[PDB]
Curated annotation (Swiss-Prot), chains A, B, C, D:
Signal peptide: none
Gene3D superfamilies in UniProt: Enolase-like C-terminal domain, Enolase-like, N-terminal domain
Gene Ontology molecular function: any one: magnesium ion binding
EC id: 5.-.-.-
Record-annotated active site: 159, 291
Cofactor annotation: Mg(2+)
PANTHER family assigned: ENOLASE SUPERFAMILY, MANDELATE RACEMASE, MITOCHONDRIAL ENOLASE SUPERFAMILY MEMBER 1
Annotated positions binding Mg(2+): 215, 241, 291
Gene Ontology process terms (BP): carbohydrate catabolic process
Membrane as UniProt keyword: no
Full protein name: Putative isomerase YitF
Organism listed in the record: Bacillus subtilis (strain 168)
Amino acid sequence: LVKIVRIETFPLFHRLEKPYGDANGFKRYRTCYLIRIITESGIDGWGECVDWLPALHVGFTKRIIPFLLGKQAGSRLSLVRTIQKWHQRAASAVSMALTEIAAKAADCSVCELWGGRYREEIPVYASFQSYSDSPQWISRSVSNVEAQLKKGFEQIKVKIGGTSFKEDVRHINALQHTAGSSITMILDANQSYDAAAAFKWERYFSEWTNIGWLEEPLPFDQPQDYAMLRSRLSVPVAGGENMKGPAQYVPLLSQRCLDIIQPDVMHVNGIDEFRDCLQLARYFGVRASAHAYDGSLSRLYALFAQACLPPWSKMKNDHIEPIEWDVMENPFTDLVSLQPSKGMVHIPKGKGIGTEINMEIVNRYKWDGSAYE
Amino acid sequence: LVKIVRIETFPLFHRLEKPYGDANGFKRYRTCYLIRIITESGIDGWGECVDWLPALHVGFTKRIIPFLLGKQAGSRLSLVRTIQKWHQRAASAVSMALTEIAAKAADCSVCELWGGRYREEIPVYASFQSYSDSPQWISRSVSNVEAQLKKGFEQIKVKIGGTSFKEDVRHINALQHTAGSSITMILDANQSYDAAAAFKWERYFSEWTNIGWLEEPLPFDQPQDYAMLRSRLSVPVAGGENMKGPAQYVPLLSQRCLDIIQPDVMHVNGIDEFRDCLQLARYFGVRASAHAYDGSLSRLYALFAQACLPPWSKMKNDHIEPIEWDVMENPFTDLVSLQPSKGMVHIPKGKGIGTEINMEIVNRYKWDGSAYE
Amino acid sequence: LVKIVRIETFPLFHRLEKPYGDANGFKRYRTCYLIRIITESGIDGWGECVDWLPALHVGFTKRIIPFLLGKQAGSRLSLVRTIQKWHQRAASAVSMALTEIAAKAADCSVCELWGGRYREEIPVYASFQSYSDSPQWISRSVSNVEAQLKKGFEQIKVKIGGTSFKEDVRHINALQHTAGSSITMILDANQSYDAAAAFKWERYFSEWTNIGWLEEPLPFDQPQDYAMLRSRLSVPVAGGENMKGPAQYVPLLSQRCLDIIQPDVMHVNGIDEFRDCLQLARYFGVRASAHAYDGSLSRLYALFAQACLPPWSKMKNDHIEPIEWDVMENPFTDLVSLQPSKGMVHIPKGKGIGTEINMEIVNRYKWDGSAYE
Amino acid sequence: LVKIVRIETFPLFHRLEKPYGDANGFKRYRTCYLIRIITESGIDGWGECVDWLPALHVGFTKRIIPFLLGKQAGSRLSLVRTIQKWHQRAASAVSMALTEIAAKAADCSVCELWGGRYREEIPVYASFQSYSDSPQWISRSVSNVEAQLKKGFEQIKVKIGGTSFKEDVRHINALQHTAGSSITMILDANQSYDAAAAFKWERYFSEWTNIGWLEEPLPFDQPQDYAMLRSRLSVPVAGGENMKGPAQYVPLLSQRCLDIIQPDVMHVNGIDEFRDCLQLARYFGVRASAHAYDGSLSRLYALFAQACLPPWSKMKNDHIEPIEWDVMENPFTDLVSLQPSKGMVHIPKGKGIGTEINMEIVNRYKWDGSAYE
């Protein structure tokens, strides 16, 4: 029954050396917002969220923190529920810090808190923001992908739908010729297309044997269009990274819209809601591969969640979905000291989250408090 | 700490002084099967299941126990999932025992283990096996109901569908005149009917203001008949107590078959799958009221689960569903010293399950090993 | 392995003393066509069909009999299958004679041949052809119904849809006032109506408590209209007496068109196909009440079939559907000596069909071979 | 004549010399449970079921046998329906025994009891448990298949879905090169996949001309996923071996889920319910090919049933579906002395089941009462 006594906030900001992006445009910076909740006993817990920092920082300092102080850290479901009404993304960060506190007070790991892992290794794919601001963007993308293939990644994700079909195809072709067919390739459209535009890829999908899935080809306004497209393509369709929770997945799965859902710990209403998304997928007989582009601490929670997820198939060697691993310039990957080895992540087994937040990163990237174009 | 070293079994049996029943026939006895899992550190936990005792006992002693000895008690998800292949009922009892151990090892209650409760009290309804083997069965039922109303139950469930509509209407009318409109009445058909037979009640549902729901009017073979009937009645329709897990509820809910689902901790694959049933209902926007007719220790788990469930409505004093409380002759109701007052059950707050199994009852009703019927 | 050696035919004809009818018009005569198949061993079997006698008699004498002679009586499925291609109604008669032969050669009853009865008593309703050729048709119908109520029939079927709604209502009202609410009344429209015309009865159905079902309100060209109407009425909808077999029921049941199907032994492809219709209904969760207006020997087979049918409900006193019992002038009711007693028929238990064909009737009503307006 | 006076039980057990399996894991032993029901007159009959022997044996000796003693053997429908409540598996064995008794008492074969056969020979396919515990599992499977092809099997079934697509394709390719296009190949996934995983085979189904069907690609939780996948593949889809009866097939067929249903005599509620499964398929216009992997005496019943089934097509030499023939190490294949020649099984024509249970095998493999695994 140990009360919350203090909460520290760490808005983080990093201007990118070279911009990159996807169909929505070029990213110029990366941000992160960490929280540390400290209880009466001294047991503490960390959380992570990502949103526009001026608005996010006041959400915490002016409303969430004053609410949380003096509250019972153990009333996790209740506290996260009430905060969800003010800022959903903040709510996810709080849910992480409170889970860490719980696991520590219980003297166990987070996976143990959840009833024990099924496995201690989780596959990851290298996730690229393939567009850059250069006429030579295709050759640079090819070089970047080659670099990561050297590291033993066997699965990659790259961007499409930001330029004409003809030009995207040239890019994908160039990657096929370097990577070869033993590398699995995922193509992310970031909702650029309509059904007919997406379908133009089918003639290539008919030939290629190494396409993992087609990701977010369409916006979600018309679920029936997803069901339509899915039944026409020769590769799996994934999506849903901007869904807010299990309730929003339910009708997409009832309508047979997707082969793979992709909840993001930070977009849904916290880690328990996130785990419910994964289970929902299992119950509907569909796959789940977390979106985690902006995560590091949150990404570790997605890995814990995957480790506690039952197999999706009876294939001895192919029965757990990979998680997204951002491979672009981003110092926040080091907030936790955990990296893949040959496309595989080994789950920390220690108490709480089994690892520590890298304070050098926290300190180096302290946000200067200013508005950032 | 938690390696499993010993498992004790307690088959229990009670011959009824006076038989009672429902549309499936008369119950002649009650049974219960308790297990006590003991770990290396001495931390123990209890589970309960119910099935025909000769076959259940051999399943534990010859398959389940030999498998569990030497296993790590904290690998709850994994172990339950493995046992679920040989025996779902057994897996449920195992899940409960492992949950108690987990909470004890964590030095918290089961509800705190799950992220903390939303509330401290849960409503219950008095559940009756209304039919007796007697021409005077209606008068008897009336007397039985009046007895429980004196204890301040505000909601009851009684049986229909075992005899002609005309005679069942006589029974219900008699109850209506004695209990009056302050008392909520739940009618349970136990799958006796087809849509047209069930629909005959509508002309009375048109007049009455105090029907809680119509329970299991039909078998579940044809889900579409449920959606059809639902749209025709003036009262909610509940069921699904014999569904084996959340995956079985999914198509029913996608098809808008039920107003209320009624999972049973002992019929689904364990306490975590049971809790997933309740979450699934919430995400589909349907109500969830646990079936708990057999069961005492499993009934306690159903109450913990309901305490950790967010509200179903925004009504200040009508936003959590009741749980079933068997009010018929059954000594196993005392296995756990928890009873409702004025139709409300206060949830135990102490470490583990916050209560002790009554060894007096366990010893008194030891099954003597004889086969029955 | 006993061959068919001889087959005798008995076209029967009876001019009605006073014509009666339904929405299709007045019946002026009744006909019956009996067959007797005799095997090498002397074991014989009877069958019954009903169709226009000139065409039916040549179907037998010129094609079916010459086919059947020298065939193995025991190859029932095969022989009935092949004859179905020439004349379906004849095929039913053959299937009956061959079943009788089988039961006799096996030294058991027909019910035993089928794996034993569930019960030995079957409820029947008195079935009226309510229209007569008189301004006083309502008073005569009232008198006819009163006469049968004296015999202890508790359920009746009468005709509607042959005249304006206003006039039919006057007739039904007159019957309600004599019979009272302890008599169950069935209303047969013989496909007179469209959805809107049928629905006009709903205002009366809203008031009456003793309506068994509404029978064949619409033609079957548009199954969706049945599904539509069923969901709007306050009484069950029955039909399907002109369906040719199980395959034709399947889509009506998949579309939730009917509460009760009504196969006719003589319209479907013989008795095994007929029993399959009954089982199909059970599997779809719907009721089955045989059409049997023109049957006597065939009616007995419908009774055997009902006796071998599992209950439709869990109601101790209401779990088997009645069969149709023609109560109009018709000497062929006496072809077999079996009559209801207070609305209940007791199934003959003896070997073969447990009864004999009444040869006095066969002889008295020999068809004179002439065309009959 | 047929009062039941004695019932003898024969649990049987065989430890495999070399384990084999499918995507669910490796089989280590085979079991069989035979019953012999003896009537007052000395007429007896046999039944077979398969389940975990300690629990199955107690179910018979303590519940089923005590119920049957003194009952009339000719009340087959009733007795089977009562037993179906305690134990479906047991009811199946009981149904078989009572059917043999019925046919014997009738002095005819089982097929004649059912109305006579349509045909005297039924095609079978060699069914393999393709996976072995060995790096050389592919070569072994190839050798095993070649061995059976030498016996003139023209159709085989092999296992997929237990390992990665890539490795399963290697296995199937190896089989294709050895067996060639004259041999029909059936691929059985044992519910390993989701739709997208199953659909990966389509690019090979596009090339191959000799695939019989794809068996159980998916679990049956979401029927709509089957209809979806069916419309995308170039080969028929079969399944349903774990459906409990015709009522469970109805929604699958209404929804156009399957090209082929695969009832199992021992998994449904008896031989009459099994035959209803096959009839249901015919009325829905779908194919029916019995699952018979375990079973020898029950396999014989499946063959009798198929001999009494009308053709599925109008193709002179391709109008009856094959039945499964287990070709793996299993001494219980000889319990009944019936084997295929050149992939065809000739149906026994003699009274009762036309054959004797091999008491040498029954005695050799007597279960010693020890619990296993």
